[PDB]
Amino acid sequence: ITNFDNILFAILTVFQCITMEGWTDILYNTNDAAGNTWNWLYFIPLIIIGSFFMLNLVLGVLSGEFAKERERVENRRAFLKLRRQQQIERELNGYLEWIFKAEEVMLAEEDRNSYFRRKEKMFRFFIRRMVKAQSFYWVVLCVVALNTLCVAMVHYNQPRRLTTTLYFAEFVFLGLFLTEMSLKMYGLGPRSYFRSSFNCFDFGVIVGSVFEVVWAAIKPGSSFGISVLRALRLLRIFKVTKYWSSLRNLVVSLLNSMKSIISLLFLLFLFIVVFALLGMQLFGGQ
């Protein structure tokens, strides 16, 4: 099938070399049929002109089209609406912190003179001030980092003292993270706990980890590997770095256009399904 016995065979093998799939086997075949001195002048230029140069042109044309389309009227309108939303949310967060400090000083003043209501509310305010303090940030990152060390060292044929150690450390870490979620949710309040998408991620991950623990208790053999996703909370170290804004706004753009992404990964699915059914029609069972 890969020969130059005809114009159509030559076109097919040249096209196969263009895709850089099996282009050396075709070269190593012309190194046996003829000498190997002059064959590289046919294929290396072919690869450079068909796979490297053409990919360059495709990237250039696509990026130019993206730049042209991005600065239209409706796309610019949507981006400015997103920017306005971000600014409004930032200002609202600042004013909410203002009002929370007001609440704190007021409640302190009334307590300076229903009693269990005041007790529980000052306890809530103390927790909410604790879970935002910089030391809680560092202790939680230390726990998360010490968690990934316990999952990065699981290897084949590990000592049995290590297997039980990590088995119990998984329970210890699940308890610690459940405690952290409980304190954070009670302090900030559930309506505000889910205001940050990363807290939604943490809640979902610990729920999945509990589900995995239960499922392993039922059937020890399987392992869904959801307890590892707690390593993604190491990604907050960027908060104390001058690069928080870039990454945070990347995630903001992704979550904003998360509907135009799901309806892109779906059309790809539809085309893959169409080609699967076409391949089943043509080559099914043969």
Ligand X SMILES: CCCCCCCCCCCCCCCC
Ligand Y SMILES: CC(C)CCC[C@@H](C)[C@H]1CC[C@H]2[C@@H]3CC=C4C[C@@H](OC(=O)CCC(=O)O)CC[C@]4(C)[C@H]3CC[C@]12C
Footprint on this chain of ligand Y (rule: CB under 6 A): 145, 148-149, 152-153, 155, 157
Confirm whether residue 239 is marked as ligand binding: yes
Please say whether the beta carbons of 143 and 176 come within 8 A.
yes
Residues between 11 and 70 with contacts to ligand X, criterion CB under 6 A = 34, 36-42, 44-45
33 makes contact, choosing from another protein, ligand Y, ligand X, none, with CB < 5 to 8 Å by partner type, with none
Task: Please give the Cα distance from 156 to 163 (Å, whole number).
Answer: 11
| Span interacting with ligand PT5, options 67-75, 101-109, 232-240, 277-285, rule CB under 6 A | 232-240
Rounded distance, CA 224 to CA 30, Å? 49
| Residue numbers followed by a gap, the chain, C–N over 2.5 Å | 113
Closer residue to ligand Y (CB): 149 or 240 = 149
Nearer to another protein by Cβ, of 182 and 224: the residue is: 224
Nearer of residues 155 and 259 to ligand Y, judged by Cβ: 155
- Which amino acid does the sequence have at 118? R
Least separation in angstroms between residue 170's CB and ligand Y is 15
Q: How far is the CB of 171 from ligand PT5 (least distance, A)?
A: 25
Tokens linked to 271: 């085309």
- The answer for residues whose C-beta is within 8 angstroms of residue 249's C-beta and 6 or more apart is 86
The binder of 145, among another protein, ligand PT5, ligand Y, none, by C-beta within 5 to 8 A per type, is: ligand Y
DSSP-derived 3-state class of residue 37: coil
Question: CA-to-CA distance for 187 and 130, rounded, in angstroms?
Answer: 9
Residue 114, annotated ligand binder? no
User: Does 234 participate in binding ligand X (rule CB under 6 A)?
Assistant: no
Tell the burial category of 143 from Cβ atoms under 10 Å away from its Cβ (0-12, 13-18, 19+). middle
d(CA 51, CA 46): 8
By CB under 6 A, what part of segment 72-131 binds ligand PT5? none
Closer Cβ to another protein, 182 or 197, answer by number: 197
Torsion from C-alpha of 260, 265, 266, 267, nearest 10 degrees? 90
Nearer to ligand Y, 49 or 162 (CB): 162
Q: How far is the CB of 165 from ligand Y (least distance, A)?
A: 13
Q: Is 192 one of the annotated binding-site residues? A: no
Strands (DSSP E) contained in 69-134 are: none
Query: CB of residue 109 vs ligand Y: minimum separation in angstroms?
Result: 46
Give SS3 for 35: coil
Does 269 sit near ligand X (CB under 6 A)? yes
Residues 6+ apart with CB under 8 A from 210: 174
Q: Under the criterion CB under 6 A, does residue 250 sit at the interface with ligand PT5?
A: yes
Write out the residues near ligand PT5 by the rule CB under 6 A: 132, 196-199, 201, 232, 235, 238, 247-248, 250-251, 254, 261
Binding site, residues? 196, 236, 239
